[PDB]
A paper describes a structure:
Na+–K+–Cl− cotransporters functions as an anion importers, regulating trans-epithelial chloride secretion, cell volume, and renal salt reabsorption. Loop diuretics, including furosemide, bumetanide, and torsemide, antagonize both [name] and NKCC2, and are first-line medicines for the treatment of edema and hypertension. Here we determined three cryo-EM structures of phosphorylated [name] individually bound with furosemide, torsemide, and bumetanide, unlocking two modes of interaction of loop diuretics with [name]. In all the three co-structures, [name] assembled as a C2-symmetric dimer in which two TMDs are separated by ~30 Å within the lipid bilayer and two cytosolic C-terminal domains (CTDs) interdigitate and associate extensively with the TMDs from beneath.
Author numbering:
A (entry chain A), B (entry chain B): 203 to 250, 282 to 931, 1002 to 1212
C-alpha cells in the first residue's frame, strides 16, 4: 500500500509520540527547541568562550597550587626536627586527608553539569544554600588570605637574597612590605590580563619549578669537597641511619611539625574552582586532581628522604675543621665519615640540617636555579589562589545568598571575568601583606581550608545517606563511610592545630549557617537535605505503621471539611486549637465543575493552599479532591485520605446555617454526610456560629461575620467552657474541651460540666460524676446536674418548631396513599407523620435542651454538647436538620460532638 | 398526655442512648451487668484483702527504709571528716536527687490506677516492656542485696556490743556470719507470717527509733563532767566554729564522703513498692513519699549539726584531764574549755569525732536506748527491702517478660503473697551475708538504685515529651525539665562514685534492654514510646510538607493495585524491588459486596494485612477501600490516598490475562482505569506474566504459576535487563530498571537499551543515545538500534490479530446505521471499523514490536518497554486491550511503563 522507502523512514514520524532525545531534557534556550519538544501527556491523551583541557586546566593548576614555600625551604627543617620516618608519616597523613577530600570532590563533581565556582557550586548544589553560602564565604576569604601569604613568602625570600649582598632599601619588614606590594600589583595585572595569559605564565612557572627540582636531584648525586664542611656529605647510609628518629632539637613537638607542614597540601581545589572555564568537567576534575595530589605527594616524600639521607642535622661550617686528625673515638654520624660538623652541641654553629633554611640551594649544583624555582613555586601558588578566590565569590554572589554582595557578580569581556572580585581579593591580600606578619594568621586559614574539605566530605556522605535516585554519581571510586571518616579526620586535624582557631572557625561557620537559614533565600536546587527530609518522613511513617493502638495513646485525627483553607477561618483555628501538637489535621476541599478545568484548578490550589498553610503557621495538610458533589468527595476523603496509621478518625463540619434558604437536595447531602461518617465508624463534630463560617465573599452583617471569624485567634479571656456531656460517646465530648484547655490561648478558661440526673438524686449523681471525672484526671470548676430535662418545652417553642417544619412535611395522613408514596419517592427528605409521632419525645428533648442551654450556658466562651444520632432510614434528613437547628439555635459558639462510641478515656495505667 | 411522673424520671430511660457512667469504662470482670453497658454506635445508627492507708502504708515504710546504719553510727564520722557545712552539703545533694526522684514517681503514679508491684509497674506502664524488665530485674536484685547489707550491719553492731563484754563464739567474721544468718531467718519468718504482722513490727521499730533519737537529743543537752574527757563538751560556739570547715584527716575526700553517705538516702520507693496493697495509690504514694523524704532529711541535717557542734574531732581518753590552772597558749577548740582531748596530734588518741564510731551512744543520756535504736533502724530497713524485692519480682514475672521466671509470679493466701519470691530473696541475702564483706558490693547496689531513679526521671521526661493526650497526670507539682535534670544528675552521681561500677551497671542495663527488645513480648500497655513514635512521624511529615519538588529529588511513589497483599506475590515483590528504601509504596485493595459485611471485612483485613506486611519485611502500606467496582475504588485511592507530599504518582497493576474469557464490562473497567490514571496525571506501570498474578485460589499449571510467583524472590543471576525506550515519557522507563539494578538481588543483571532509528544512520543514533544516557549516568552494557520498525509484520501475525479481534468488532460498515448506533451505545467497548482503519499503523506497530521483542529479547531476565497511550474517545477499550495483548505475549516477565511525561531525569546538578 506504500513504497518500500516509506516503510524505512525515521521511526516516530507517523505518530505524535516522540522518541527520547537530548533536546527533550536540555533547558538551555538553544533555538527555543524547534524540534526538541516532547508532547505532553494531555496532548497524546485528550480527546480530539575559552575552555581548558584536563591537563592544563586542572592538573597543572593543582600541582602549582599544592607546591609552595615549603617545597624548597622548610622541608629540610621538617626532616631535621623529625626523623625521616616521622616526616614521611606527617606527609602521608596530610596526603591522606587531601586524598579523601579529592575523592569526595570527584564524586560530587561527576553527578551533574557544574557551572561556576569549584568548591562553592558543588557544595551548594549537593547540600543546600546555607552550607553553600557559609563555605563559599569561608573558602573565598581563605584563598584571598593565602594570596597574601604566598606573596609574603616570595618577598621574604627575595629580601634574604638581597641581604646575601649589600643591596637594601629600608628595614627588613619595610623591604618585605615593598616587595610584597609590587608582587601583588604584578599578579593582579597578570590575572586581569586574561585567563590564557595566566595559563601561559603558569606553564612557564611549572617548567621552571621542574627544572629546579631536577637541579636539586642532580646536585645531591655529585658531592663536592667544598660542601663537605657544610652538612652535605653525599649519600651515606650512616647519615640515613642517624637522621632517622625524632631528634626534636627545640621546643617543638610532632604536632607542631604537622601544623607547620599542613599548608603544603592545601591547593587541591585549584582545578575545581576553574569549573566555569573547563571544557568538560565530570572528566577533568577527578582525574586531574587525583593525579596532581599523587605527583605532589611523591615529590614531597622523595625530596624529604633524599635531603635526610645526605645532610647532617648539625654542621659547624669551618674549613679548618675537617680531617679530624687520623683516628677518632667519635660515634657521631658525621664523625664516621669525616671530622666536619663536630663540636656543635655547646656552641651554636652556623648552619646544618637543623639551623640552615637554604640547605636545598647548597646541595643543588646550581644555586640561582633553586632560587628561581622557589620564586616560581611561590608565585604560581599566589596566582592560583588569586584566580580561585574571585571565581568562588562571583559564583556565590550570582545566587544572591547575601544580597549585600550582589555587586561582585557582574562579568566583563567575552568570558565573564569577576573584575570586581579581582580588585577585592587584591585589596584583601595587599592589606594582609602590609601586616607582613602572617605567622598568627596561618592557622586560621589552615582551619578554613580544613572546614571546606570536611564539608565536602560530609556533603558526599549526606548525599549517600539520603538515597535519592538522582544521586547517581559517575565517579565510582568513593565510599560513604570513607567520606564520613574523611570529614571526621578533617575536623580532628583542624582541632589538633590551634584549637582556638578551630573553635573560631566553627563559630563563624555556625553563625553563617544560622544567618542563611533565617534568611531562607528563594531558591531550591534539589539538595540532599530535601531528599533526607523525605526519607526520614517515610521511615518514621513506616515505623509508626507497626505500632499497636491503645486507648491512652488515642489522638484525635480530624478530617476537617473546610473547603478553601482560608475560606472559613473560625473552623480552621478551632480545629487547630485541639489538634496542634496532638493528633493529625487534614483540610479537605471538594472541587466541582468540569473535570478538564477542575484538574488545573486543583493543581494550582494544591501549591497555593499548602504554601498558605505553611506561611500561616498552621500544622495542617491540604487534601484537594475532585468530585461531582460534596458527599462523594467526602466519601473519597473518608475512605482513602491519610497514610498507614495516620489516617483520620473524626469528621469535623460547619453547620449548614442557610439550610432553610437552600435546595433540599443540599440538605439531604449534608445529612447523608453525617450518616456516612457514622457508617464508617467516624466521630462527627459540628461547629455552629451565629454569623456562619464563610468569609470568602466578604455592612453591619459583614462586619459581625468578620469579627466572628477572627474571634478565635486572640487569648480567650477566662469566661467558661461549658460541656454538656449528656450521652456516653466514649469520652470525645470531654476530650475535646480538655485539649482546648491544654493550650495557652485557652488556659484561663475553666471547664464546668453539665449532666442529666434524677430530681431526688442530685447530690448522688453529682458525686458520681465528680469521682468519674477525677479518675479521668480532667480538671473541672463545677458540676451542674439538671433534673428538668424530659419536661415539656414551652408552648411557644413547640409552635415555632412546628411552623419551621411545616414546609418540609409530607402530610401522608391527609393524602392518598399512591400520591404520598410518589411524593416520598422523589423527595426522600420529606418528613412523614409517622416518624414525627414516633419521635415527638426526641423533638421535645431537643427543644428543651435548647431552652436549658439558653438559660444556663448563655455566657460561656464555648459550648460542647452531645450530638444527637438519628437512626438511618427512620428519620428524615429534614427532621435531622430541624433537630440540629433547634438544639443549637441562638447560642454562643457551640460544638456538637458524637464520638466513635469506643472509649477514648481511661483511668487505668 | 402523661402524669406529673414520667416527666421528672431518670434522664435517659426513654432512649437507647446511655448517659456517661463509670461502669461504661470499668473493664473489671465484676460490675459488667446490663446497667453498665454502653450501646454501640451501630446499635444506635443501623436501620431497624488487706489495704493500708497512706500513713502506715507509705510514710512509715519510707521513713523506716531511708533510716539505716548511718543514722547512729557514721553520721558523726561524716561530720568529722568533712565540716558541718560540707556534711550538710552532701546531705542536701543526696536529698535533692531523692526529691527529684520522688517528684517523678508521684507524677508517674497519678496517671491512673496502679495495679501492683512497685517502681517496676510504674516504669513499665510509662515507658515500655524493655525498660520495665531491665529496671525490674536491677531493682529486685538491688533490694535483695540491700537486705543482705542491712542484716550484715545489724550483725556487726551486735558483735561489737558483745566484744564490749566477755562474750564471743568464733572469730569476729564468723560470729557476724552466725548473727546474720539468724537475723535473716527471723526476718524471713516475720515477712512470711503476713503483712499486718509486718506492719505492726514496723510500727514498733519506728517507735523505738524515735525514742532513740529523742534520747540522743536529750543527752546532748545535759553535759556531764564524766564524758568531758571524751570529745563531748556540750553545746559550745568554739566547737561549732572549730568543727565547721573540712578536715580530711585520713586519705579521704569530699567525693568519698558523698559515696559513703549516699546509701543513707535510698529507700524512698518502699511505699511505692507496696502499691498492690495500698487502699488507693495516686493519693498515698506522692504525699507519703515526699513527707518521708522531708522528715528524714531534716533529721539527718539536725543530727549532723548537733553532733558537730558539741564534740571535738580529736579527743583523749585519759581521765587525768588537762589545762589544770595553766595559761591559755593553744588556739585549739578544746583548750577554750579545758585541756581534755588534747596532745594527740602525733600519737593516735583513744577516740573522738575522727576516731570513735559510737559518739552518739556516748553523747546520749542512756547508751542502751541508742543501741536499741540502731538495732531497730537496721532491722526495719532490712525488713522493708526484703518485702519490697518479692513484690517487684512478682509484678515483673506476672508480665511474662522473662519466661524462665514465670514460676515466681504465683501467689498464696487470701492476699496474693509471693512465697517463692520471698524464699529467693532470702537465699540471695543469706549468700551475701555468708560473704560477710559487702564493702566492695555497696557501690554496685548504690549504682543500681541510682539507675532506677534515673530511669524513673527519664520516664517522666519522655512522657512529657511525647504529648500524648492520655498523659494527664494528677500530681501537678513536677516539670519535664526538672525531671530530665534529675535523670542526668542521677547518672552523673552514679558515675562519680565507683566509675567502673557505673559502667558495669550501664552495660547490664543495655544488655537487658537488648534482650527484651529482641524477644519482643506480646504486650501492649500504651507506653510513651508509641506516642513518641506517632508524634515523630507526624512532625517529620509536617516538615516534609514544606519541601519544594525538584527533578533530581523525584522518587517513584507507586500506588500498586494488588488486592490482597499476599494474593499476587510477584507484583508485590517487583514493585518492592524498585521502591524499597526509595519512594513510597501503597498496596491498594478494593472490596466489593454488601456494605454491612464489607465494613467488618475491611476492618479485619486492615489489621491482618498490615501485620502480614510487617512480618514479611515489606515496607508497604495497606490501603483498603470499599467501592461498588474496581474503577470506583481506584478513583478513591488515586484522589485521596497518601498524606501531604507523600502521595502516589504512579499506578501499578497486573495485566488482565483472562480478558478474552471475561465479561467485556470488566475489560472496559480495566481500560477506564488506565484512562483515569492518565487523566489524573499518573504514571502507569503494567506487569504481565505468562501464568498470571493471582495465586490465592491455588497440577502442572498450578505448579508453574507458583514457580512464577516465587521467581522474583531469589537472586536473579547473570541475566540481562532489556529496556525498550521507544518514546520519551520523561525517563521513568529508564528510571525503573536502574532502581532495579541498584539492589543486591539485581546486581548481576546488566541493562540493555533498545531504541528506534533510521537505516543508514545506525551509528549516529547509537552514539547520540549513548551520549544522552551517559549524561544521565545510567550504566548500560550495550545499545541496539532497530531500523526494521514500521515494516509490515508477517501475514500470519496480522491474521491472528484479526481473528482475535473479530468477536468484538462493531462492523458498522455492514449495518443499517441505526442498529449499529444502538449496539455502540449499549456496548461502548465495541471496535468500530473507522478506528481500525485509522489506527492500522498503530496495530501493525504493536504486532511488529512483539515480533522484534520475541526475536531479540526472548532471553532477557525482565523486559521494560514503553506503554502505548490510546487517545480517550478515539480508541475502543477492546482495541486498547488487543493492542496491549499483541504487544506483550509469549515473552519473559515484561513491564509496560508510561511516565507522567514530566522529566524525571536530569544531567544538571
Ligand atoms: N467544597 C465545599 N463546599 C462547601 N462546603 C464544604 C466544602 N468542603 C467542605 N465543606 C463543609 O460543608 C459545609 C457546608 O456548608 P454550606 O456552605 O452548605 O452552608 P453555609 O451556611 O454556606 O456554610 P458556610 O457559612 O461555611 O459557607 C461547610 O460548613 C464546610 O465545612
Ligand atoms: N480488588 C481487586 N480485584 C481484582 N483486581 C484488582 C483488585 N485490586 C487491584 N487489582 C488489579 O487489577 C488486575 C485485574 O486482574 P483480574 O481480576 O482481571 O484477574 P487476571 O486478569 O486473571 O489477573 P490476576 O492473575 O492478577 O488475577 C489485577 O492484576 C490486579 O493487579
Ligand atoms: N609554614 S610555611 O612557611 O612553610 C607555609 C607553606 C605554605 C605552602 O603552601 O607550602 C603555605 N601556603 C599558604 C597556606 C597557609 C594556610 C593554608 O595555605 C603557608 C605557609 Cl606559612
Ligand atoms: N556506708 S554505711 O555503712 O553507713 C551504709 C548505710 C546504709 C544506709 O541505709 O544508711 C546502707 N544501706 C543499704 C544500701 C547500700 C547501697 C544502697 O543501699 C548501706 C551502707 Cl554500707
Ligand atoms: Cl584547596
Ligand atoms: Cl528506693
Ligand atoms: K599549598
Ligand atoms: K537507706
Ligand atoms: Mg456557604
Ligand atoms: Mg483474577
Ligand atoms: Na606553587
Ligand atoms: Na531502717
Amino acid at each position: 500500500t506504500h513504497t518500500n522507502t516509506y516503510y524505512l523512514r525515521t521511526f516516530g514520524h507517523n505518530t505524535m509520540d516522540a522518541v527520547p532525545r537530548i533536546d527533550h531534557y536540555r533547558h538551555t534556550a538553544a533555538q527555543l527547541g524547534e524540534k526538541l519538544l516532547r508532547p505532553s501527556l494531555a496532548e497524546l491523551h485528550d480527546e480530539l568562550v575559552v575552555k581548558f583541557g584536563w591537563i592544563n586546566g586542572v592538573l597543572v593548576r593543582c600541582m602549582l597550587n599544592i607546591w609552595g614555600v615549603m617545597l624548597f625551604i622548610r622541608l629540610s627543617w621538617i626532616v631535621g626536627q623529625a626523623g625521616i620516618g616521622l616526616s614521611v608519616l606527617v606527609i602521608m597523613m596530610a596526603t591522606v586527608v587531601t586524598t579523601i577530600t579529592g575523592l569526595s570532590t570527584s564524586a560530587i563533581a561527576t553527578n551533574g553539569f557544574v557551572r561556576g565556582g569549584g568548591a562553592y557550586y558543588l557544595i551548594s548544589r549537593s547540600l543546600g544554600p546555607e552550607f553553600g553560602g557559609a563555605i563559599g564565604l569561608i573558602f573565598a576569604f581563605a584563598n584571598a588570605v593565602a594570596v597574601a601569604m604566598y606573596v609574603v613568602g616570595f618577598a621574604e625570600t627575595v629580601v634574604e637574597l638581597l641581604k646575601e649582598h649589600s643591596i637594601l632599601m629600608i628595614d627588613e619588614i619595610n623591604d618585605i612590605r615593598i616587595i610584597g606590594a609590587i608582587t601583588v600589583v604584578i599578579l593582579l595585572g597578570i590575572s586581569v590580563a586574561g585567563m590564557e595569559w595566566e595559563a601561559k605564565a603558569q606553564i612557564v612557572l611549572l617548567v621552571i619549578l621542574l627544572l629546579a627540582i631536577g637541579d636539586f636531584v642532580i646536585g645531591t648525586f655529585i658531592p663536592l669537597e667544598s660542601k663537605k664542611p657544610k652538612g652535605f656529605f653525599g649519600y651515606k647510609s650512616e647519615i640515613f641511619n642517624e637522621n632517622f628518629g625524632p631528634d626534636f632539637r627545640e621546643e617543638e613537638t610532632f604536632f607542631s611539625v604537622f601544623e607547620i607542614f599542613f599548608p603544603a597540601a592545601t591547593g587541591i581545589l585549584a582545578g575545581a574552582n576553574i569549573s566555569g572555564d573547563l571544557a568538560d568537567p565530570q572528566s577533568a576534575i577527578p582525574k586531574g586532581t587525583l593525579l596532581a595530589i599523587l605527583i605532589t605527594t611523591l615529590v614531597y616524600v622523595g625530596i624529604a628522604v633524599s635531603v635526610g639521607s645526605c645532610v647532617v642535622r648539625d654542621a659547624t661550617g669551618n674549613v679548618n675543621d675537617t680531617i679530624v686528625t687520623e683516628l677518632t673515638n667519635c660515634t657521631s654520624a658525621a664523625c664516621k665519615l669525616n671530622f666536619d660538623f663536630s663540636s656543635c652541641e655547646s656552641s651554636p654553629c652556623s648552619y646544618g640540617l637543623m639551623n640552615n633554611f637554604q640547605v636545598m640551594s647548597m646541595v643543588s649544583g646550581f644555586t640561582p636555579l633553586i632560587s628561581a624555582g622557589i620564586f616560581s613555586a611561590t608565585l604560581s601558588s599566589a596566582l592560583a589562589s588569586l584566580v580561585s578566590a574571585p571565581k568562588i565569590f562571583q559564583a556565590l554572589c550570582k545566587d544572591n545568598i547575601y544580597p549585600a554582595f550582589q555587586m561582585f557578580a557582574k562579568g566583563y569581556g567575552k568570558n565573564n571575568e569577576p573584575l570586581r572580585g579581582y580588585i577585592l581579593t587584591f585589596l584583601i591580600a595587599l592589606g594582609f601583606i602590609l601586616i607582613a606578619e602572617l605567622n598568627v594568621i596561618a592557622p586560621i586559614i589552615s582551619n578554613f581550608f580544613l572546614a571546606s574539605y570536611a564539608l565536602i566530605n560530609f556533603s558526599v556522605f549526606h548525599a549517600s545517606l539520603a538515597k535519592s535516585p538522582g544521586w547517581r554519581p559517575a565517579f565510582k571510586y568513593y565510599n560513604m563511610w570513607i567520606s564520613l571518616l574523611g570529614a571526621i579526620l578533617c575536623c580532628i586535624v583542624m582541632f589538633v592545630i590551634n584549637w582556638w582557631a578551630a573553635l573560631l572557625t566553627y563559630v563563624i561557620v555556625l553563625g553563617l549557617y544560622i544567618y542563611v537559614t533565617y534568611k531562607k533565600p528563594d531558591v531550591n536546587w534539589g539538595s540532599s537535605t530535601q531528599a533526607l527530609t523525605y526519607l526520614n518522613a517515610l521511615q518514621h511513617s513506616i515505623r509508626l505503621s507497626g505500632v499497636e493502638d491503645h486507648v491512652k495513646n488515642f489522638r484525635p485525627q480530624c478530617l476537617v471539611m473546610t473547603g478553601a483553607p482560608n475560606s472559613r477561618p473560625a473552623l480552621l483555628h478551632l480545629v487547630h486549637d485541639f489538634t496542634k501538637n496532638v493528633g493529625l489535621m487534614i483540610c479537605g476541599h471538594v472541587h466541582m465543575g468540569p473535570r478538564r478545568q477542575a484538574m488545573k484548578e486543583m493543581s494550582i490550589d494544591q501549591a497555593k493552599y499548602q504554601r498558605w498553610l505553611i506561611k500561616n503557621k498552621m500544622k495542617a495538610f491540604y487534601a484537594p479532591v475532585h468530585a461531582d458533589d460534596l458527599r462523594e468527595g467526602a466519601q473519597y476523603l473518608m475512605q482513602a485520605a491519610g497514610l498507614g496509621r495516620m489516617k483520620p478518625n473524626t469528621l469535623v463540619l460547619g453547620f449548614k446555617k442557610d439550610w432553610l434558604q437552600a435546595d433540599m437536595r443540599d440538605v439531604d447531602m449534608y445529612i447523608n454526610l453525617f450518616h456516612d461518617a457514622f457508617d464508617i465508624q467516624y466521630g462527627v463534630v459540628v461547629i455552629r456560629l451565629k454569623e456562619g463560617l464563610d468569609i470568602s465573599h466578604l455592612n453591619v452583617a459583614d462586619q459581625k461575620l468578620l469579627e466572628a471569624s477572627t474571634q478565635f485567634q486572640k487569648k480567650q479571656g477566662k469566661n467558661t467552657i461549658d460541656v454538656w456531656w449528656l450521652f456516653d460517646d466514649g469520652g470525645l465530648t470531654l476530650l475535646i474541651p480538655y485539649l482546648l484547655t491544654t493550650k495557652k490561648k485557652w488556659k484561663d478558661c475553666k471547664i464546668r460540666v453539665f449532666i442529666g440526673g434524677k430530681i431526688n438524686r442530685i447530690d448522688h449523681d453529682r458525686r458520681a460524676m465528680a469521682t468519674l471525672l477525677s479518675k479521668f484526671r480532667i480538671d473541672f470548676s463545677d458540676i451542674m446536674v439538671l433534673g428538668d430535662i424530659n419536661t415539656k418545652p414551652k408552648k411557644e417553642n413547640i409552635i415555632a418548631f412546628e411552623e419551621i417544619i411545616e414546609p418540609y412535611r409530607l402530610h401522608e395522613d391527609d393524602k392518598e396513599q399512591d400520591i404520598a408514596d410518589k411524593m416520598k419517592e422523589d423527595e426522600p427528605w420529606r418528613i412523614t407523620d409517622n416518624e414525627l409521632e414516633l419521635y415527638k419525645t426526641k423533638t421535645y428533648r431537643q427543644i428543651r435542651l435548647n431552652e436549658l442551654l439558653k438559660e444556663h450556658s448563655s455566657t460561656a466562651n464555648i459550648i460542647v454538647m452531645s450530638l444527637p444520632v438519628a437512626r438511618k432510614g427512620a428519620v428524615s434528613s429534614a427532621l435531622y436538620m430541624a433537630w440540629l437547628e433547634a438544639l443549637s439555635k441562638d447560642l454562643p459558639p457551640i460544638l456538637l460532638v458524637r464520638g466513635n462510641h469506643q472509649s477514648v478515656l481511661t483511668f487505668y495505667s
